[PDB]
Design a protein around this ligand. Structure first.
Ligand SMILES: *[C@](O)(C(=O)NCc1ccccc1)[C@H](C[C@@H]1CCNC1=O)NC(=O)[C@H](CC1CC1)n1cccc(NC(=O)OC(C)(C)C)c1=O
Ligand SMILES: *[C@](O)(C(=O)NCc1ccccc1)[C@H](C[C@@H]1CCNC1=O)NC(=O)[C@H](CC1CC1)n1cccc(NC(=O)OC(C)(C)C)c1=O
Ligand SMILES: [Cl-]
Lengths: 302, 301
């Protein structure tokens, strides 16, 4: 068996998805209390998209321009307000299904679940990671914009992503729910590129810990390296630097397996230099970097 | 861009999961209308597992022996029946969150989502396939039994799997929602084992057509093949025989790309010969067999 990518159950977020229409632009909105959050580029007409001025484009629009649909119910808009790259629409009706939630901003390497929606209607959910180059590997088609990413901790939904655009190489970019982009992108029709991605070293080590715990142990060795020595080799193969923070965060998985992080690094050094040498780890021929230490401690240990 | 491993939104299933307790044994149940479906082995002690006589263990139970909990609300058992390896508990309260649903028995190679649950609490959603040896790959632990697999096509929930047990290789076995096992397995702790696992050939081809529609052609070649000559090679790599049905099934992905399915088979043959040479297809450096022809058409427009 493969140690599978697990998404959070999505039901708490499903009850929050509405359709937002502004002329001929239709995409997804997040309905929490009496406010609908959606990408501000729903106001853009197509000619505007080239070089838009959003502040003067919003003054121009008025409440009745925004058609909001929760299933077969029309929400009446009674307010609009911009916040960075998200549009907040005040509606007449609070969402009776509003879960406990906060807005958070995740760091690169951290994972979250995405609820892909089209026309305010949820389509699918999958687990992914904020890449070091602030993009996400995924699958979004036309009408996917306004789709959100989140973590669940007890009954509390942490919303961390709103989807905005596709890049070259079929990867994706969006904002937190306060409308701030992840990575050096802007909401215009313009030539934009992710630029060189790196592997998430701390996640790879976590996934080697997950492997050891599920009995896959062939890559272990007698050697231990050091941070400076490991980072020399990491830097070479396009691997995020490993910091003393990373070592500390892996501490639990270290003590639960008797494999000191710097021993496992020696293992990883040897997999980067010599390759997989014919074998697999948890059924994968590549080193997986989209499981965090927390993910591995959750799904596995617990 | 877009052809990645996606589960269905789990919300319609989350509102059905409950906890079922009999003695010291607690597992998950599925609450649709006024019935709770769960694995019948809920009525077994750690001891009865080797040779349980289910009819004998069940005749000795009363409705009040079954503690069913929908979060904090205790449901009242007012009836009980056994269908194959599933226990059906009648309760006094219909589930008001019951979606539109049906029970379906799937064929090996079919995909579905699994809502993994512990103690009636959903933990996670993941997408998988009925392997050809009628097992499932993933991660269920102590607590996961009675977790269910489903598809959601246009608001109708099709329940096709309920989790029962783990087999020595760390693969998983279970039943349809009528309590009939997928495969030749029994709800019993006797050393049984899975037939050898083969690659779902029709699914890999679907995925090669997916890579082409997404604008990736590096693996294509000038050759075609006979069906018979393709299976003679593919069996040598432990690939499932391809049938006329698989070829009929792939028709629309062929027509859409103008690559005949026997020309795609020719590519796969060479992929099997050569490996990837450090290249990747839609992001993976192994051939992906848990995406069906139907899954490809749905995630393409
Ligand atoms: C988003 O705006 C959206 O879904 N809008 C509604 C809609 C659009 C089109 C047709 C019907 C309905 C989309 C989502 C994109 C499109 C396909 N995959 C996605 O994830 N985002 C954009 O269209 C986005 C808007 C920009 C930020 C303001 N955009 C515009 C122009 C170009 C691109 N990218 C692009 O062309 O990507 C490559 C890979 C270069 C082809 C883009 O995402
Ligand atoms: C299922 O009943 C369950 O979820 N257990 C409830 C529970 C236990 C402990 C505490 C709280 C709640 C389990 C699920 C299994 C076990 C671990 N992984 C799984 O997917 N089902 C069984 O344990 C099952 C019951 C048998 C069919 C009637 N069973 C019993 C005994 C042995 C095994 N298999 C086993 O030992 O697996 C190997 C791979 C050999 C370790 C088994 O599945
Ligand atoms: Cl892989």
């Amino acid at each position: 068996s493969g140690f599978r990518k697990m998404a959070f159950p999505s039901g708490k977020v499903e009850g929050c998805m509405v359709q937002v229409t502004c002329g001929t632009t239709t995409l997804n909105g997040l309905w929490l209390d009496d406010v609908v959050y959606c990408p501000r580029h729903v106001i853009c007409t197509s000619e505007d998209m080239l070089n838009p001025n959003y502040e003067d484009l919003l003054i121009r629009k008025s409440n009745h321009n925004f058609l909001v649909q929760a299933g077969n119910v029309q929400l009446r808009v009674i307010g609009h307000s911009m916040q960075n790259c998200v549009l907040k629409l005040k509606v007449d009706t609070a969402n009776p299904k509003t879960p406990k939630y906060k807005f958070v901003r995740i760091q690169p390497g951290q994972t979250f679940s995405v609820l892909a929606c089209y026309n305010g209607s949820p389509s699918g959910v999958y687990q992914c990671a904020m890449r070091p180059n602030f993009t996400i590997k995924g699958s979004f088609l036309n009408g996917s914009c306004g789709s959100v990413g989140f973590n669940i901790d007890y009954d509390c939904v942490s919303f961390c992503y709103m989807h905005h655009m596709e890049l070259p190489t079929g990867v994706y970019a969006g904002t937190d729910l306060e409308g701030n982009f992840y990575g050096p992108f802007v909401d215009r029709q313009t030539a934009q590129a992710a630029g060189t991605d790196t592997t998430i070293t701390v996640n790879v080590l976590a996934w080697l810990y997950a492997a050891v715990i599920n009995g896959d142990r062939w890559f272990l060795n007698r050697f231990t390296t050091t941070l400076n020595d490991f980072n020399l080799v990491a830097m070479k193969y396009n691997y995020e630097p490993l910091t003393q923070d990373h070592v500390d965060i892996l501490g639990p998985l270290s003590a639960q397996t008797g494999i000191a992080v710097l021993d496992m690094c020696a293992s990883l050094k040897e997999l980067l230099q010599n390759g997989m040498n014919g074998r697999t780890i948890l059924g994968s021929a590549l080193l997986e970097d989209e499981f965090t230490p927390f993910d591995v401690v959750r799904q596995c240990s617990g």
